[PDB]
């Protein structure tokens, strides 16, 4: 803004030190991209140099449905193009009117005591520049937004990378999970072919839709696994969804920015992973189905419950993140997206659409402790539920704990999970009092809705 540290307060005032720099790069970018009707290089005009009952009910519904496009005409109102031009001759003629009085009054100001006003008042003469600046920013926004339909790119990235669309998220994770747990554990599930095959399969079977937007979707990996570990945790499996960006929005969406988007996919997937086996263990108890209903086992009843308690905690955790990010922060970003009116402004809305989602995610580094307890909790749930699957029931007579005789070991595990739960009840509070983490108030609020502990 200052030449070295030598800023010209006389000409820049340090005010247009930055504005001049911005307008220059934006006109050069839009024009660089292509002549647009509103500007089209020097096409801008005379800018002063200055410086059935169901069917009738259906028709009522048709009008209600048609009301939404009438409301959506307002969304599509900004790129008029033909009316944009009239504003400009009027728009630059309007400055001429101040510019008309200013020159004459400049003679009066010059006549009065050399300068009637302070020497610094000369900033009034350079003021018209702002007019060009306004036109530049507004124009860029339409090209960047309606012409390039940017919101849709954010909307799809949210849908597939943050897994908002429910069907797509469950299937891509589902096929992979069967394979990851089943075998092929030495990166035989990393065959580029299987990865691509599942991705296309996931995208096609999502049913939210097949679109030009679905393009640029890629299934990929970064760190290479030597082998998948016990419980097939893929606790950090480096499967990176990669999203290509077009030249203009390549500037709008920075590589570091999509680097952050990947993180949620990771944790969310692991949550889904946790979810998978549990549904399955209940399905496995339903696989036994006590099919020998002829024999009703007392121990069965007991375990039938241990599964539910561990299941109850993980359903709450997946719920907590969802409201915090899926409907609590995208709504905020959309209001900011509507508000942003300039390239720099657009960069900071998406920037905090994510700096915030990450903060509410708890993946933030300062919040490591809660994530750490989660790991211990999540590890126990994965490994111990896997044990009941390993064993098989036994002869039907009297009390029969021996059905899956390893059951005894699991009870010890049931108590370890509980120990962490109580600890987590104490951990969230330990942090809330020391500083301000308004987000964590929501965490604890849900964890113990009814008791010191459940």
């Amino acid at each position: 803004i200052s030449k070295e540290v030598e800023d010209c307060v006389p000409v820049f005032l340090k005010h247009i030190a930055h504005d001049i720099y911005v307008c220059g790069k934006t006109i050069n970018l839009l024009k660089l991209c292509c002549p647009r009707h509103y500007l089209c290089w020097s096409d801008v005009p005379v800018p002063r140099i200055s410086v059935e009952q169901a069917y009738l009910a259906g028709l009522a519904g048709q009008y209600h449905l048609e009301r939404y496009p009438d409301s959506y005409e307002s969304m599509s109102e900004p790129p008029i193009a033909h009316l944009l031009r009239p504003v400009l001759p009027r728009a630059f003629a309007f400055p001429v009117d101040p510019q008309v009085q200013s020159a004459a009054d400049e003679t009066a100001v010059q006549l009065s005591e050399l300068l009637t006003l302070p020497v610094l008042m000369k900033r009034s003469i350079t003021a018209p520049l702002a007019a060009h600046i306004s036109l530049v920013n507004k124009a860029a926004v339409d090209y960047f937004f309606v012409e390039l339909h940017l919101e849709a790119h954010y909307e799809a990235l949210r849908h597939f990378l943050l897994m908002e669309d429910g069907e797509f998220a469950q299937s891509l994770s589902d096929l992979l999970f069967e394979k990851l747990g089943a075998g092929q554990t030495p990166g035989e599930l990393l065959n580029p072919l299987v990865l691509n095959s599942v991705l296309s399969k996931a995208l096609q079977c999502s049913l939210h839709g097949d679109t030009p937007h679905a393009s640029n979707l890629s299934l990929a990996l970064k760190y290479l696994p030597e082998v998948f570990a016990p419980n097939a945790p893929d606790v950090l499996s480096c499967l990176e969804l990669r999203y290509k960006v077009d030249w203009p929005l390549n500037i709008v969406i920075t590589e570091g920015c999509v680097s952050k988007y990947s993180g949620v996919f990771s944790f969310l997937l692991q949550l889904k992973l946790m979810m998978w086996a549990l549904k399955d263990v209940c399905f496995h108890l339903k696989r036994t189905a006590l099919l020998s209903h002829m024999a009703g086992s007392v121990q069965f009843r007991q375990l039938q419950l241990f599964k539910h308690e561990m299941q109850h905690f993980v359903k709450v955790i997946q719920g907590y993140i969802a409201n915090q990010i899926l409907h609590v922060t995208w709504c905020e970003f959309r209001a900011r997206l509507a508000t942003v009116g300039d390239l720099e402004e657009i960069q900071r809305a998406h920037a905090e659409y994510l700096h915030k989602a990450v903060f509410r995610g708890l993946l933030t580094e300062k919040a490591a402790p809660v994530m750490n307890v989660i790991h211990s909790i999540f590890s126990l749930v994965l490994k111990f539920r896997s044990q009941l699957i390993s064993q098989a029931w036994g002869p039907p007579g009297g009390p029969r704990g021996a059905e899956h005789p390893n059951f005894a070991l699991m009870q010890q595990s049931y108590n370890t999970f509980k120990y962490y739960s109580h600890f987590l009840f104490k951990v969230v509070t330990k942090l809330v009092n020391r500083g301000y983490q308004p987000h964590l108030e929501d965490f604890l609020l849900r964890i113990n809705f009814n008791n010191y502990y459940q």
Binding site: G58, G61, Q62, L65, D165, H327
Partner: protein, 420 residues
């Protein structure tokens, strides 16, 4: 996977007829079964897709000695439901025996749809308890489905009948149905004729035509209970995830119903949530406590309100529960449809596991116990005696339902960790 609804019995066929009609207007559908021109939702589960967009519901309509049954056929929506799968006493035994001779053709009609669908996740029965033909036939079909299709999960929209207590054998018929339902239902959603009749008297002056008007009330609950499945969501998209939270122990699988707008014909979430916890909005008629509660709200809800709202209901404690299960109320949100009116755009429903429903089960068990001693209505009809000479299934049912009555109250106690 797509859901197949086995609507059976005259009463059950009446609420399936309306439920499908309710999703006809709510979804982009027409009486012919083709989509409307004016028409982002997940119609795959509930509606089969024909080649020319004839979205035909996967409804299985079972009829027995049909006379008023023909009324469903003489309707503008006769074309809408054309899987071409409809196949031809007031006693539970009379219904069970009739079902057994025709079991294989009705079961092949189940197979056809199962083969036709990409997949089949659950069988949702519009069951009528003590429904004359509807009960007995419904219990038998409940027993066959689990054996053949163990992998799938069953639900029952049981319209438990309470009319202030005509059927003189009503308690006996109901007693037998529950023993099967407890044993062979993965889930059951309970409704009450009197509870809804009391609501009808409350919201409206309608008293004498209680059955016709109450059909709309049962429907609004039924469409609403599956709206999260029918419309796209970030969570509980699958039926199973939803079912797990509502039923924490297998035996206690009966679910209570409520609607925040007793009259739906702005409101903040903090308000809509509080209405579910008032008993005037509930539709079901020693300490007692809920086992776990869930709620689904509809429309463009303001979200920040919910954090305030969820922490808000907590201070209010309007819902009192301390069961063996953890029991946090769960908050869900969905989109109100873009065809139907936006009047009362925000509108909610709650599905909850409550030990109070045990009392309704004990009242029919009370009528039956009184009736059993008198033996006033043993029927002794040759069908009844020949089918059941020992009459010991009623006693087998009595011990199984008493175990259920006992289990519920055990849930109220501090030690359901021990056997219940």
């Amino acid at each position: 996977r797509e859901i197949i609804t086995l609507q059976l019995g005259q009463c059950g066929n009446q609420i399936g007829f309306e439920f499908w009609k309710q999703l006809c207007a709510e979804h982009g559908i027409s009486p012919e079964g083709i989509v409307e021109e004016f028409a982002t939702d997940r119609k795959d589960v509930f509606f089969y897709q024909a080649d020319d967009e004839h979205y035909i519901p996967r409804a299985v309509l079972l009829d027995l000695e049909p006379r008023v049954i023909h009324s469903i056929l003489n309707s503008p929506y006769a074309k809408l439901y054309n899987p071409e799968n409809i196949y031809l006493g007031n006693n539970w035994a009379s219904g069970f025996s009739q079902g057994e001779k025709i079991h294989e053709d009705i079961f092949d009609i189940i197979d056809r749809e199962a083969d036709g669908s990409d997949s089949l996740e659950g069988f949702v029965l519009c069951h009528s308890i003590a429904g004359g033909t509807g009960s007995g036939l419904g219990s038998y079909l409940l027993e066959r489905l689990n054996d053949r299709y163990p992998k799938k999960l069953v639900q029952t929209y049981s319209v438990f009948p309470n009319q202030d207590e005509d059927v003189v054998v009503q308690p006996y018929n109901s007693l037998l149905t529950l023993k099967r339902l407890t044993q062979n239902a993965d889930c059951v959603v309970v409704l009450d004729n009197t509870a809804l009749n009391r609501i009808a008297t409350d919201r409206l002056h309608i008293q004498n035509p209680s059955f016709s008007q109450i059909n709309q009330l049962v429907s609004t609950i039924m469409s609403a209970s599956t709206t999260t499945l029918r419309y796209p969501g970030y969570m509980n998209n699958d039926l199973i995830g939803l079912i797990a939270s509502l039923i924490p122990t297998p035996r206690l699988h009966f679910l209570m119903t409520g609607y925040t707008p007793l009259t739906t014909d702005k409101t903040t979430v903090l308000d809509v949530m509080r209405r579910l916890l008032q008993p005037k909005n509930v539709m079901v008629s020693t300490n007692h406590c809920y086992i776990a509660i869930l709620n689904i709200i509809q429309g463009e809800v303001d979200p920040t309100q919910v954090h305030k709202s969820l922490q808000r209901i907590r201070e209010r404690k309007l819902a009192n529960f301390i069961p063996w299960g953890p029991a946090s109320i769960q908050v869900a949100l969905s989109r109100k449809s873009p065809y139907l009116p936006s009047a009362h755009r925000v509108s909610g429903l709650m599905m909850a596991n409550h030990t109070s429903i045990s009392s309704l089960f004990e009242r029919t068990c009370r009528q039956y116990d009184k009736l059993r001693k008198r033996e006033a209505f043993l029927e002794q009809f040759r069908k009844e005696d020949m089918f059941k000479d020992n009459f010991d299934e009623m006693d087998t049912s009595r011990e199984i339902v008493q175990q259920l009555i006992d289990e519920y109250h055990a849930a109220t106690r501090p030690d359901y960790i021990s056997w219940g």
